[PDB]
Structures are given as structure tokens and as C-alpha cells.
């Protein structure tokens, strides 16, 4: 199978504070090397590598091509942002929280208690563990956020314990999709 | 910042294959089917609130085919360097025996955007309700992609996501199997 050649083009809009402050950044990427780009805060093209020189100088000439690009920030960015805001920016699916120990073993034996939170969107959430109402900050091993690729996230937050009877463990989840924190206890 | 919306499109030769899509914070919003010439929303629900003219994309790609033939020659025909994938089989939600779930095959950090993913249940290929996503982009100019297999957990089975890529010495198997 012959050699491969890849041309890639990306216009990315980064929104800060909601809509006040947007940055358009147009990148042309040949193979894995970016060659030229348009950065809204610099108003014009700039070759990043030598092969992007011709174009950075070419397009930079067309005072019309540069006239629009600079306005793409509201004609394209702020636009597309207000088009999907209802379903993207304001998407909220609710987290589904579960508490279960891995490795059923006897009490007083080290056990890793797992808090699986899955199905949520947006990715911003907060998971805390409590042992007998007092927050347990240590021995908390997390998988970090995991993006399912279907517009929902998931993450696993484990607490290392040595359960004595009656100790009650709680998992508290805070997510924009909910008013008051989801909690879920586990009895020794 | 807070959110990023990206229109990523590419054209690849010899394959003569391209893609055009929009991405919001890492997830795909939609992408234009080059063949049927129609925009395909990622979650049907999206199509009920917004629209995009699939021809817009076919136009754009036309130029990309072009700029590519251009750029190749000026590079002096330098080809791409294969970066093999970073596969990891995951599960949609905590598996309970006999209760439907979905197995996710996550393929990351690879380039060129060409890869063969097979699902195997007990050593044998499976197409039952399997599906995938187009090549999602990444800041490092490599790609990302997902394959999903809806399944029903039981202690009897074991699976594999079988990934083939040019920067790989041989077909990568990533294994999964319920545990008690």
C-alpha cells in the first residue's frame, strides 16, 4: 500500500465567559504539521512553517478575504454558538450514581468502595465521599472524567476503606443537571 | 475558556476520502455524508433544532482535494508517519448480569485516519447492533474514534475489539469479560 497524504483544515471558535470573548483560529494542517493559520487576535494569516508561506502571503493580499475572516467572529462563531446553545451549551442529562464495593470480603478487611456516576452531561460534576457523615478526603482514587462519545460522560471514584460494622458511607454528587446533590449510602 | 466549536474537515489520498463535521467540546454535533450528500446529526434530537446544508460541505471538500494535491507536491511528496492507536474497551455503565449494557471500543491518538475495528464474541465476529462514529479530531492533529456493541452480560461470554492500523505491527486485541 502506497504513501499517504493528509490535508486537514480546522476553524475553531473558543468562547470565554459565555459569549463575551470569542477567538477564531483557522489552521491548515498538512500531514501532522500545521503550515498556516488565521488567528482573530492577530487579524491576519501567519505561516507557522515554511510551506505555509506562499498562502499566508497570498491570502493576506485579498483585503476582502481578510475583511470577512475578521468578522467571522460574529458572522460564524457567535452565530453557530446561538444556533445549538439549546442542545449543546445547555444540555443536561442527569448522572446515574451507584455505590458498591469491589471484592466482597469480611468487615475490617481493606475494601475499595466504588462510586460509579454514569450517563451525565455536561462533563463538570463533583464527587465526594463521606464516612459517617464526615467527608473523607484521603484514599480517594479516581478515574477522572470519561467521555463516552455519545454526548454523555462517566467516571469512577473509589474510596479505600477498612469497614467496621455500622459505618455508613455516602457518595455525594453535584451536577448542573440537579438542584440538590445526589447521595447514595452503603452500610457496613 | 469555556467551550470550543470546531469544523474539522480533511481529505486523504490515495484513498481519496474526506470528512466534514462539527464538534462541540469534544463531542460530534453532526457530519456530512459525502455519498448520500446529507448531514447526519449525532443524536437525532439535534436535527430537530437546527439545520446545515450538506452541499456546503461537498463544496469545501472539493477545494481540499485540490489544496492537497497542491501541498503534496510542495512538501516534495513527503508522506505521513503512521501513529498507531491507543485502544481501550470500556463499558457504558456498571454491568449487571442479564441486564443490557453497551461495550465501547475507544481508539485514540492515531493518524492517518484509516483503521479496521472488529468486535468478537467468543473469538467470533459480531455485527449485532454494532455501530461507530466518524474520525473525531484532536488538538494534536491525530484522530479519535468510537465503536459501540450493545450486549447483554452473562458469565458465559468474553469479547475483543480487534483493531488493525498501519502503524501497528499486527491486529490489536483489547479484551473484556464480566468479573465476580
Amino acid at each position: 500500500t502506497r504513501p499517504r497524504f493528509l490535508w486537514q483544515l480546522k476553524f475553531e471558535c473558543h468562547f470565554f465567559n459565555g459569549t463575551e470573548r470569542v477567538r477564531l483560529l483557522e489552521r491548515c494542517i498538512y500531514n501532522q504539521e500545521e503550515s498556516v493559520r488565521f488567528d482573530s487576535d492577530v487579524g491576519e494569516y501567519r505561516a507557522v512553517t515554511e510551506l505555509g508561506r506562499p498562502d499566508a502571503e497570498y491570502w493576506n493580499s485579498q483585503k476582502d478575504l481578510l475583511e470577512q475572516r475578521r468578522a467571522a467572529v460574529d458572522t460564524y462563531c457567535r452565530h453557530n454558538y446561538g444556533v445549538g446553545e439549546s442542545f449543546t451549551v445547555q444540555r443536561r442529562v442527569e448522572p446515574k450514581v451507584t455505590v458498591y464495593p469491589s471484592k466482597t470480603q469480611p468487615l475490617q478487611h481493606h475494601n475499595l468502595l466504588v462510586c460509579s456516576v454514569s450517563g451525565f452531561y455536561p462533563g463538570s460534576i463533583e464527587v465526594r465521599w463521606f464516612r459517617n457523615g464526615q467527608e473523607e478526603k484521603a484514599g480517594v482514587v479516581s478515574t477522572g472524567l470519561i467521555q463516552n462519545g455519545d454526548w454523555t460522560f462517566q467516571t469512577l471514584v473509589m474510596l479505600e476503606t477498612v469497614p467496621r460494622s455500622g459505618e455508613v458511607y455516602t457518595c455525594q454528587v453535584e451536577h448542573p443537571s440537579v438542584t440538590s446533590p445526589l447521595t447514595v449510602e452503603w452500610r457496613a | 475558556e469555556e467551550h470550543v466549536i470546531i469544523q474539522a474537515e480533511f481529505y486523504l489520498n490515495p484513498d481519496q476520502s474526506g470528512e466534514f463535521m462539527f464538534d462541540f467540546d469534544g463531542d460530534e454535533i453532526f457530519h456530512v455524508d459525502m455519498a448520500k450528500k446529507e448531514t447526519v446529526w449525532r443524536l437525532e434530537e439535534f436535527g430537530r433544532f437546527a439545520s446545515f446544508e450538506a452541499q456546503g460541505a461537498l463544496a469545501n471538500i472539493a477545494v481540499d482535494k485540490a489544496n492537497l494535491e497542491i501541498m503534496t507536491k510542495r512538501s516534495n511528496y513527503t508522506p505521513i508517519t503512521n501513529v498507531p492507536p491507543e485502544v481501550t474497551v470500556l463499558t457504558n455503565s456498571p454491568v449487571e448480569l442479564r441486564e443490557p449494557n453497551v461495550l465501547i471500543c475507544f481508539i485514540d491518538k492515531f493518524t492517518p485516519p484509516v483503521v479496521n475495528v472488529t468486535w468478537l464474541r467468543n473469538g467470533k465476529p459480531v455485527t449485532t447492533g454494532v455501530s461507530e462514529t466518524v474520525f473525531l479530531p484532536r488538538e494534536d492533529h491525530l484522530f479519535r474514534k468510537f465503536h459501540y456493541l450493545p450486549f447483554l452480560p452473562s458469565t458465559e461470554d468474553v469479547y475483543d475489539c480487534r483493531v488493525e492500523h498501519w502503524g501497528l505491527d499486527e491486529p490489536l486485541l483489547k479484551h473484556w469479560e464480566f468479573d465476580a
Partner: peptide, 13 residues
């Protein structure tokens, strides 16, 4: 609403 795409500029020859 309509998603507004951005067009690709042809390279320098």
C-alpha cells in the same frame, strides 16, 4: 437556525 459553515480558500499556485 442554520449552521453556518466557513469556506476553504484555495492554496497559492
Amino acid at each position: 437556525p442554520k449552521y453556518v459553515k466557513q469556506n476553504t480558500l484555495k492554496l497559492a499556485t
